[PDB]
Each structure stands twice: as structure tokens, then as C-alpha cells.
Coordinates of N, CA, C and O in Angstrom, one line a residue:
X230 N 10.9 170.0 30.8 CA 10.0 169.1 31.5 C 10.7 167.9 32.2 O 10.6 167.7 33.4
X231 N 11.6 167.2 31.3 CA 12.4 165.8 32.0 C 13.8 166.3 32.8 O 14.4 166.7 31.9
X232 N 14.4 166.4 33.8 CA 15.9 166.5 34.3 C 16.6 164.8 33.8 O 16.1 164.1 32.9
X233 N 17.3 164.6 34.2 CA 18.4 163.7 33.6 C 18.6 162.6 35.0 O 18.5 163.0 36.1
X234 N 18.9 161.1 34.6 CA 19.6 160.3 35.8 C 20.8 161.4 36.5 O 20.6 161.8 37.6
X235 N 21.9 161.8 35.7 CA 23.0 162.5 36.3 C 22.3 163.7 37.1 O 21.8 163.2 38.1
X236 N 22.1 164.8 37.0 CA 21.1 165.4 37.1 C 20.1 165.4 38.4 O 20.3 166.1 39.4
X237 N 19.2 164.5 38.3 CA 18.4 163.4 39.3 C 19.9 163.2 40.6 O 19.8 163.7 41.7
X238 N 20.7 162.5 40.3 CA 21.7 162.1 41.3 C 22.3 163.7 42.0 O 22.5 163.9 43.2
X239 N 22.6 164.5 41.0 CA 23.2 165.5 41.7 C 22.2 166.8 42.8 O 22.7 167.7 43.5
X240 N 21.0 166.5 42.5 CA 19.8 167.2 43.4 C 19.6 166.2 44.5 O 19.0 166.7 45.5
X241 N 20.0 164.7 44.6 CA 19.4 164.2 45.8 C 20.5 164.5 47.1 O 21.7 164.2 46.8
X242 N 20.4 164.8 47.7 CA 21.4 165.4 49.1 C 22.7 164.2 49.3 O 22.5 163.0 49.4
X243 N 24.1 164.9 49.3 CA 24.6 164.5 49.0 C 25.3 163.4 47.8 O 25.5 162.3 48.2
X244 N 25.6 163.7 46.4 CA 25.4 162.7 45.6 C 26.4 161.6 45.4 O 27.5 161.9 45.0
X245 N 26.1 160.4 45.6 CA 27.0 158.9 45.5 C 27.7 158.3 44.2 O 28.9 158.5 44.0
X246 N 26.8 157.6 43.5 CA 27.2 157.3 42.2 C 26.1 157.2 41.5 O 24.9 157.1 41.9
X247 N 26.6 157.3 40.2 CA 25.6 157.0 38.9 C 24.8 155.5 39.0 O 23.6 155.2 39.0
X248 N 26.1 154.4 39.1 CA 25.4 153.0 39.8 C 25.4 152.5 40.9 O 25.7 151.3 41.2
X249 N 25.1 153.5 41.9 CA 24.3 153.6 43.2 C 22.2 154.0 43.0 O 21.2 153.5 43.6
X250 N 22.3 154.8 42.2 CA 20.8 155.2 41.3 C 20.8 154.5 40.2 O 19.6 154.5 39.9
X251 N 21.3 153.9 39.5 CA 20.8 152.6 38.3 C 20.6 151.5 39.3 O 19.8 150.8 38.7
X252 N 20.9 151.0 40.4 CA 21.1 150.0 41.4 C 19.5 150.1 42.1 O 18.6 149.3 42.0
X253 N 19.4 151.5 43.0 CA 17.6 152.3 42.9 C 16.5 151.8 42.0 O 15.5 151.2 42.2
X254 N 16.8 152.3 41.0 CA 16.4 152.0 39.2 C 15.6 150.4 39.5 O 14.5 150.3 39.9
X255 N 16.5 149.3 39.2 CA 16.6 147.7 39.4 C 16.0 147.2 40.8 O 15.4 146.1 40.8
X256 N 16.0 147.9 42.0 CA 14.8 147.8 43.4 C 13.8 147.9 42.9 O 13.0 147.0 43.2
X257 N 13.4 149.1 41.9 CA 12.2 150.0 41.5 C 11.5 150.5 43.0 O 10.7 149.8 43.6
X258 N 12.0 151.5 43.4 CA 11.9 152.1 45.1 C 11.9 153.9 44.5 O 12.2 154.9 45.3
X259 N 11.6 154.1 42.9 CA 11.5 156.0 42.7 C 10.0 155.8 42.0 O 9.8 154.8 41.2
X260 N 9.0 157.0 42.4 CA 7.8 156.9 41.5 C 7.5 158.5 41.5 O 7.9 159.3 42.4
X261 N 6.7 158.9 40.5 CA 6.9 158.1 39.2 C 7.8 157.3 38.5 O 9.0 157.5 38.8
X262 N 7.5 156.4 37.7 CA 9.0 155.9 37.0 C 9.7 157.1 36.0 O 9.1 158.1 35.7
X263 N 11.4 156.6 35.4 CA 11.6 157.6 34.8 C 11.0 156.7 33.3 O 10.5 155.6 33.3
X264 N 11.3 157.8 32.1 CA 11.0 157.4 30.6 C 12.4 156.8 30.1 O 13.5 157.4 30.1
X265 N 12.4 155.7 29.7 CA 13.5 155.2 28.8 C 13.3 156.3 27.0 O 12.6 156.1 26.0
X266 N 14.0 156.9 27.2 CA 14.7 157.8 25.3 C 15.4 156.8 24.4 O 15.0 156.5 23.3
X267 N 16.7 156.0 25.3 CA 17.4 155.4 24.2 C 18.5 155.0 24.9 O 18.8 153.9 25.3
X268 N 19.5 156.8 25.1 CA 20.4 156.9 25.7 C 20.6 156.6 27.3 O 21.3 155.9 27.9
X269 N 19.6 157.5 27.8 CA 20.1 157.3 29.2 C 17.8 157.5 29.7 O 16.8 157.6 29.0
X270 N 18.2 157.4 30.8 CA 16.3 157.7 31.5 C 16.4 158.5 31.6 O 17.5 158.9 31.8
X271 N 15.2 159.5 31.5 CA 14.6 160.5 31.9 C 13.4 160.6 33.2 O 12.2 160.1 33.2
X272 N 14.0 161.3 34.2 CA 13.3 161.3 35.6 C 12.1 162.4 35.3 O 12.7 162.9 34.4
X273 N 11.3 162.9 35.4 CA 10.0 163.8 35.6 C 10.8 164.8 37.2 O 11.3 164.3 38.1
X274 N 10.7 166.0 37.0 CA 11.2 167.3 38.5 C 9.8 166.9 39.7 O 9.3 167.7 40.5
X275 N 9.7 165.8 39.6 CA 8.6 165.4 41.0 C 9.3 164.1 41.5 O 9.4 163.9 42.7
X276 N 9.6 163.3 40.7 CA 10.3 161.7 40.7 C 11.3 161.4 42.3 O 12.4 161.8 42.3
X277 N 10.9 160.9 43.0 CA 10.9 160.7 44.1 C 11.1 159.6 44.6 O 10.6 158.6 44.1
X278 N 12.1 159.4 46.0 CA 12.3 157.4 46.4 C 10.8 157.5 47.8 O 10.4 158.2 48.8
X279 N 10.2 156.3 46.9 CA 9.1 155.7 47.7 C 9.1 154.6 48.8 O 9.4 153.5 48.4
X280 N 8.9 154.9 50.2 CA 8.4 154.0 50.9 C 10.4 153.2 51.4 O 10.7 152.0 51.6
X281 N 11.0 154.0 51.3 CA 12.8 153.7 51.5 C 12.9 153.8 53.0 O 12.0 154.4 53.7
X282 N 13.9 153.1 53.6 CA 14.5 152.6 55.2 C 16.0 153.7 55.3 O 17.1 153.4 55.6
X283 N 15.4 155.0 55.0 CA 16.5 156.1 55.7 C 16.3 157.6 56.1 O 16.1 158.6 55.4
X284 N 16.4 157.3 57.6 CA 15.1 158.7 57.8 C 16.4 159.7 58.4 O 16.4 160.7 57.8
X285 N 17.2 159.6 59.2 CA 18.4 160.9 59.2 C 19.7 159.4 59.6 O 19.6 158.3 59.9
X286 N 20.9 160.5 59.3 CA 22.1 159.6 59.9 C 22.4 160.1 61.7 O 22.8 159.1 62.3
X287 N 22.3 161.3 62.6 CA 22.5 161.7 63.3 C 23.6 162.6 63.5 O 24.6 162.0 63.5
X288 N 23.8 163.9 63.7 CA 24.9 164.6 64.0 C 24.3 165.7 64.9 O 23.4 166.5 64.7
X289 N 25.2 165.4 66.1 CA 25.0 166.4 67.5 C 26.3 166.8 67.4 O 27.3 166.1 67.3
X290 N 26.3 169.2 67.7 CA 27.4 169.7 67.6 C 27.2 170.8 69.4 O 26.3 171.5 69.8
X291 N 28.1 170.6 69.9 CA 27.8 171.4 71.3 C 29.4 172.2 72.1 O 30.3 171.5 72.6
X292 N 29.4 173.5 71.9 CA 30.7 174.3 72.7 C 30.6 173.7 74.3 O 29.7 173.2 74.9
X293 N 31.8 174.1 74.6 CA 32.5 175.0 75.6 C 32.9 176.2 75.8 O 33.9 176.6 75.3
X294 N 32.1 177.1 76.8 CA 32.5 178.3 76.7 C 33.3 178.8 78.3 O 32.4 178.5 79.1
X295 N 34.1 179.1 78.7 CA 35.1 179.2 80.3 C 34.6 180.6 80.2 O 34.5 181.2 79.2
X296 N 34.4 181.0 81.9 CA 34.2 182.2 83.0 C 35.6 183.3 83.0 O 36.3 183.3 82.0
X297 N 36.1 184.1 84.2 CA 37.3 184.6 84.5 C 36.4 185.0 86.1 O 35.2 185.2 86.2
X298 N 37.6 184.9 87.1 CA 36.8 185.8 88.4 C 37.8 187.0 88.7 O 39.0 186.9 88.4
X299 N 37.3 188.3 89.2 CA 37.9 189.7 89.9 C 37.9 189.7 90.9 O 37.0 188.9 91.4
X300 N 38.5 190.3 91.6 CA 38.6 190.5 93.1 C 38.9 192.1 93.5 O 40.1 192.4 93.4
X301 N 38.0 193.0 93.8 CA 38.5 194.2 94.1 C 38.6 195.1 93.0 O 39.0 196.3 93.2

């Protein structure tokens, strides 16, 4: 039922640090919230960042391809 903070970090696209998502955590910017156990939180497999300021970074990729000419 619960996935894990570690876990949680390594499904979000490209993963940063553990206190880069405890830092998330302390904004409170993921909902549902996770469950405190003891040891570490437990995120819910829906737990999601809400209402966040990052919509793509940008990457444009484009060739060159060259001709030859014949004669006769």
C-alpha cells in the first residue's frame, strides 16, 4: 500500500537527494501528506507535488544532413 521517501525520490524523474524531498516535506508542496511510522515517512503510490513553479527545463535536438551532385 505505502512506497517509501527513498523510493518516492527514486520514481520522481530524475532523482536529487533524500534532503532535497525532506526540504519538499518542510514547504509542505506533496498531497496527500505522507504517514510518519517512526523510522522514516511513508508516501501513499498517488502522493504527488501540488500547485509547484516547474513545468519543463527545455531541450531542442536538430541534424545536418549534405547532398552530392553527378554529371553525365
Amino acid at each position: 500500500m505505502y512506497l517509501t521517501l527513498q523510493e518516492w525520490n527514486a520514481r520522481q524523474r530524475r532523482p536529487r537527494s533524500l534532503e532535497t524531498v525532506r526540504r519538499w516535506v518542510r514547504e509542505s508542496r506533496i498531497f496527500p501528506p505522507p504517514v510518519k511510522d517512526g523510522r522514516e515517512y511513508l508516501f501513499h503510490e498517488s502522493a504527488v507535488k501540488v500547485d509547484l513553479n516547474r513545468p519543463v527545463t527545455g531541450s531542442l535536438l536538430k541534424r545536418i544532413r549534405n547532398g552530392k551532385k553527378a554529371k553525365s
